[PDB]
Design a protein around this nucleic acid. Structure first.
Ligand SMILES: O=P(O)(O)O[C@H]1[C@H](OP(=O)(O)O)[C@@H](OP(=O)(O)O)[C@H](OP(=O)(O)O)[C@@H](OP(=O)(O)O)[C@H]1OP(=O)(O)O
Lengths: 501, 536
DNA sequence: TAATAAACTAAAAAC
DNA sequence: GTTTTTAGTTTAT
């Protein structure tokens, strides 16, 4: 399926005002945030449809000719030209191009704005799954002076929830704070919340607005729904997710040289002598050892792999201190209860999560992902929910599925005679370590291979300027670190390296 | 490297007398030897294996001159193992009716290594003894045996029906390859206590205080890789330089500590009649994906990539020039941060690297030891840039200290890029108004976790004894594959055999943990309603 | 030379 | 059925 996401940006006067900030304007903050989603959907080959609509402008552009509503881009797949068009409204110069092309500061009515957005969902030729509208505004009471417009906005917002269209508010900073209880409390779509009324805080930085949109730019997608068996009779349903996944360079695609059209590829198998098609029952598997051939059927090469049925068999509970950090084998996964399959799984899941945290214990399981695969011991490490100052979920509540290696996966290296350093040498390295100290964040580094690969595709797809070279953010800032250390490098050298080295 | 191994098995009469419930020491040692020869055959190593049997009815060894070393048979001489050896282990070799001096059989085993490794290159020489220590023996050759083992540099290992400690389950649950029980220490005789002491003194002379670690039980040997311990091939090092800036360099050498093995041989798809590979051929055809399936020749296909909805032609030639190009091999430090800022749920890659100093470089060993202890004394780690060579894509990873009593090193694990993360928002379970468990439900889970505890705090010194160490159990898919490959070779008409029970016994927790949880699981089944949804 | 990682093919399962 | 992921090969640096 194809999810749909419409970016709705306010074009009022306050959107172009950096009201006492060391940061961009709320409009420039929204335009750059939309570009990042457009690019990130292309990095991951996402098939979602994106749209860009502005309201409050002097010029209008929509099917029903509703005033002060400009549809910049209808619902369609992102491209190089669509990203280049959004770049025309970036920064101070982009503020001038936007106001000269559409105007700003004009009046509006949120009822008419939501009618145009819902009309974009109906015009889709593709099949759609999720239909969501993302609103960017720093105005918490758009129609506190016009009850006729605020009442029609609440009725249209309620009609969207019944239709199946979600509305997420990306409220930006306002002098005195953004008050959601004034108006947008009866508009945003929510029902899963446990009557907590949490919601994200107001966005004052581009990084915060980006993470809040990134938390809703892509929906959940489970890697597999498996059975977590305490025994043979007590079985709950869990969902396996990959919160981390190595984003690789997209594979090439074969085209027709005279039309640049993609080409279908079909691979078949035939007998060499007769040329007839080979059924799966017309061939067998072979393995030669020395001068002897061992022939197995295709059904038997999979039968020797068969051990457990797909799922998680509970082995016991092991304290967290017995799980070594240097025993990493492959990227860990996330386990969350799947209430849609087995009713009552979340209650047992929560009780297991609560007691595993109090006792600092992990649930050892025998893990079988698919059918006909040997098992692997995994440790479900309890994981408590964590929110930051923006009420963004940095750590989701559940279990961290940590893969445990077998005895074969361990490899030994030769031992040294352990040469230790003196406290005078350790002290000099301590001062070097303290000089190059920084705050690490899991999203601080970008892939230089992936960035440069798509920078080359942009230069070929748009045919504008030559491909520039990306700045490798993984290379050390050599000149900055040398000045930062000073003479600490010549020191420690005299304490360790002899002049005859 | 290559190694020569001599398997010295006891087939005497006492090897067929066991305790009710557990198999005979003859059948236990017969499966440990089968496990060893199976991996040596199907991995197709260059290791040579000989088999000496003592306790047989007959006598066939090059030391029998003068009614000496009787009831000792050299069933297999030093050569590459084959299917004929495995078939003899599976069918031909029968238990004997006599009893032989197990030290005399060790002398015959030493005679095979001394006379048959004559010209061949062997980096290691090893002898493994499988006996129950139930028979009498002479102790005059004790100093002669140790002098020949040290002058010839021959390692030694022992495998007994019982563990070198004690047993608490009185004849109790006894399963081959299980966790916990391994023959009752109260069921051994005083002759076995005398022979075990001689085994200790021999291993202490050859290895030292760690010589006691080379005495295993047949049950625990089936769920470990101890039989291959003395003949494992050495790991390859990775030379590079750890750089802090541009004026500080430290020569280092990296090894892969964790790396998944998986299968070694590939299945070749062959014809069902000729059983040959050349009779099979695959042809991949190209055609227009859209309307009208028209074939395309290779002289009309170019390379392209997708940029969202755009299709961008990009030949491999133009791709080679505009490609990102790095300087190459490196291990450069970007900075240092608190270890708490690096959670293990962010670990990436399919390997773990241990970074030592360059071998025989004391100056580099002192420099790296300063970095290891500085990070440890500050509770900090190093964020570094790792690149295997000029071809591999550069990585961002973490290097945290690892201080032991015999060596110090840095442990490298790859860290994720920003493009690798996914911010899936999940519903709150702590602040849940729907799935919050009751007090009785939490007490049932609390009682279940205590009953299913896989650790034991013995002697009351916070010393946790792991009752189920999964990292010491071998991957069951290997010995399961070796079982089927050998079964098809020796029995082509019979179907594949089922999984051996000692494999299932090692893949399960101790029997005390399973029985302890029956009552807590029963209360959980009644307190937690569970039913499948069938409506949508 | 072997060691190994970037590429690539095939099959399972979610949507 | 289509799309993402992963075990299983493949083949060059
Ligand atoms: O009993 P554990 O708490 O699990 O200790 C293990 C075990 O060592 P010991 O049984 O000798 O105490 C490992 O031994 P093997 O897996 O090789 O049989 C050893 O591995 P090494 O032989 O590589 O040293 C490993 O040490 P490490 O994982 O650091 O290599 C060490 O764990 P600790 O380092 O926590 O003591």
């Amino acid at each position: 399926g194809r999810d749909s996401l419409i970016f709705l940006v306010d074009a009022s006067k306050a959107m172009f005002e950096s009201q006492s900030e060391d940061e961009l304007t709320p409009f420039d903050m929204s335009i750059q945030c939309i570009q990042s989603v457009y690019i990130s959907k292309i990095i991951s080959s996402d098939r979602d449809l994106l749209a860009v609509v502005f309201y409050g402008t002097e010029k209008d552009k929509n099917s029903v000719n509703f005033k002060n509503i400009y549809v910049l881009q209808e619902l369609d797949n992102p491209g190089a030209k669509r990203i280049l068009e959004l770049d025309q409204f970036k920064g101070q110069q982009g503020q001038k191009r936007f106001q000269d092309m559409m105007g700003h500061g004009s009046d509006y009515s949120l009822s008419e704005v939501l009618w145009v957005c819902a009309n974009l969902f109906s015009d889709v030729q593709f099949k759609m799954s999720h239909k969501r509208i993302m609103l960017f505004t720093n105005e918490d009471n758009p129609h506190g002076n016009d009850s006729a417009k605020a009442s029609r906005a609440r009725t249209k917002a309620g009609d969207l929830r019944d239709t199946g269209i979600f509305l997420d508010l990306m409220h930006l900073k306002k002098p005195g704070g953004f008050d959601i209880s004034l108006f947008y409390r009866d508009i945003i779509s929510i029902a899963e919340d446990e009557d907590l009324r949490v919601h994200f805080e107001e966005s004052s930085k581009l990084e915060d607005l980006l993470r809040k949109v990134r938390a809703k730019e892509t929906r959940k997608r489970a890697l597999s729904r498996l059975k977590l068996k305490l025994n043979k009779d007590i079985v709950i349903s869990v969902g396996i997710y990959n919160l981390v996944q190595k984003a690789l360079k997209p594979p090439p695609i074969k085209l027709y040289r005279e039309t640049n059209e993609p080409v279908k590829t079909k691979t078949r198998t035939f007998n060499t002598s007769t040329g007839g098609l080979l059924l799966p029952s017309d061939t067998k598997r072979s393995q030669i050892y020395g001068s002897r051939q061992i022939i197995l059927e295709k059904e038997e090469t999979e039968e020797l792999k068969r051990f457990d049925d797909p799922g998680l068999m509970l082995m016991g509970f092991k304290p967290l201190v017995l799980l070594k950090k240097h025993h990493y084998l492959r990227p860990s996964l996330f386990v969350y209860p799947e209430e849609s399959l087995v009713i009552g799984s979340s209650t047992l899941f929560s009780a297991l999560l609560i007691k595993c945290l109090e006792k600092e214990v992990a649930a050892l399981c025998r893990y079988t992902p698919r059918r006909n695969i040997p098992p692997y011991f995994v440790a479900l490490v309890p994981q408590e929910e964590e929110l930051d100052d923006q009420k963004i979920q940095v750590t989701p509540p559940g279990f961290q599925l940590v893969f445990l290696p077998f005895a074969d996966d361990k490899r030994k290296m030769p031992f040294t005679e352990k040469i230790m350093a003196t406290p005078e040498q350790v002290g000099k390295m301590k001062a070097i370590v303290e000089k190059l100290r920084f705050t690490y964040r899991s999203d601080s580094f970008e892939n230089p291979v992936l960035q440069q690969h798509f920078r080359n595709l942009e230069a070929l797809a748009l045919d504008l300027m030559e491909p520039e070279q990306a700045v490798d953010l993984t290379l050390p800032k050599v000149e900055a670190m040398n000045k930062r250390l000073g003479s600490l490098v010549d020191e420690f050298k005299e304490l360790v390296y002899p002049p005859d080295y | 490297n290559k190694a020569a191994v001599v398997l010295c098995m006891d087939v005497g009469f006492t090897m067929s007398n066991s305790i009710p419930g557990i198999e005979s020491p003859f059948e236990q040692a017969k499966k440990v030897i089968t496990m060893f020869v199976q991996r040596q055959v199907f991995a197709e190593n260059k290791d040579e294996i000989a088999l000496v049997l003592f306790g047989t009815d007959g006598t066939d060894n090059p030391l029998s001159g003068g009614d000496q070393y009787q009831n000792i048979t050299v069933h297999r001489h030093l050569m590459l193992p084959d299917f004929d050896l495995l078939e003899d282990i599976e069918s031909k070799i029968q238990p004997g009716s006599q009893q032989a001096d197990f030290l005399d059989a060790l002398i015959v085993s030493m005679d095979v290594i001394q006379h048959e490794t004559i010209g061949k290159k062997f980096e290691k020489r090893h002898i493994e003894i499988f006996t129950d220590l139930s028979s009498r023996f002479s102790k005059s050759q004790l100093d002669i045996i140790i002098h020949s083992l040290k002058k010839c540099d021959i390692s030694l290992q022992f495998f007994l029906p019982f563990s070198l400690g004690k047993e608490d389950g009185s004849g109790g649950p006894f399963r081959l390859g299980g966790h916990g029980p391994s023959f009752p220490l109260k069921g051994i005789t005083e002759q076995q206590k005398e022979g075990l002491e001689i085994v200790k003194m021999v291993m202490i002379s050859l290895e030292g205080e760690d010589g006691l670690d080379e005495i295993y039980s047949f049950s625990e040997s089936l769920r470990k890789l101890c039989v291959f311990k003395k003949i494992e091939r050495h790991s390859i090092h990775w030379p590079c330089r750890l750089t802090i800036g541009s004026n500080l360099s430290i020569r280092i050498a990296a090894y892969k500590s964790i790396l998944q093995e998986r299968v070694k041989k590939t299945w070749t798809v062959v014809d069902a009649k000729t059983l040959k590979k050349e009779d099979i051929q695959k042809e991949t055809v190209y055609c227009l994906n859209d309307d009208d399936e028209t074939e395309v020749l290779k002289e009309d296909i170019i390379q392209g990539f997708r940029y969202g909805s755009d299709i961008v032609p990009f030949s491999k030639v133009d791709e080679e020039q505009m490609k990102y190009k790095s300087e190459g091999k490196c291990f450069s430090v970007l900075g240092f941060c608190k270890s708490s800022q690096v959670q293990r749920r962010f670990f990436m890659g399919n390997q773990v690297l241990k970074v030592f100093a360059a071998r025989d470089d004391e100056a580099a060993a002192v420099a790296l030891s300063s970095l290891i202890h500085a990070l440890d004394d500050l509770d900090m780690v190093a964020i570094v840039r790792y690149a295997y060579d000029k071809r591999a894509n550069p990585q961002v990873g973490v290097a945290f200290p690892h201080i032991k009593h015999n060596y110090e090193c840095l442990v490298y694990v790859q860290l994720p890029f920003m493009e690798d993360l996914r911010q899936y928002m999940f519903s709150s379970l702590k602040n849940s108004k729907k799935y919050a468990p009751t007090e009785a439900q939490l007490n049932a889970v609390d009682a279940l976790i205590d009953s299913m505890s896989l650790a034991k705090k013995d002697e009351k010194t916070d010393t946790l004894e792991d009752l189920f160490p999964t990292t010491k159990i071998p991957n069951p898919r290997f010995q399961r594959l070796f079982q089927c490959l050998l079964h098809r070779a020796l029995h082509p008409r019979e179907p594949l055999p089922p999984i051996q029970q000692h494999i299932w016994n090692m893949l399960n927790p101790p029997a005390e943990v399973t029985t302890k949880s029956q009552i807590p699981l029963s209360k959980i089944k009644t307190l937690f309603p569970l039913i499948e949804a069938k409506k949508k």
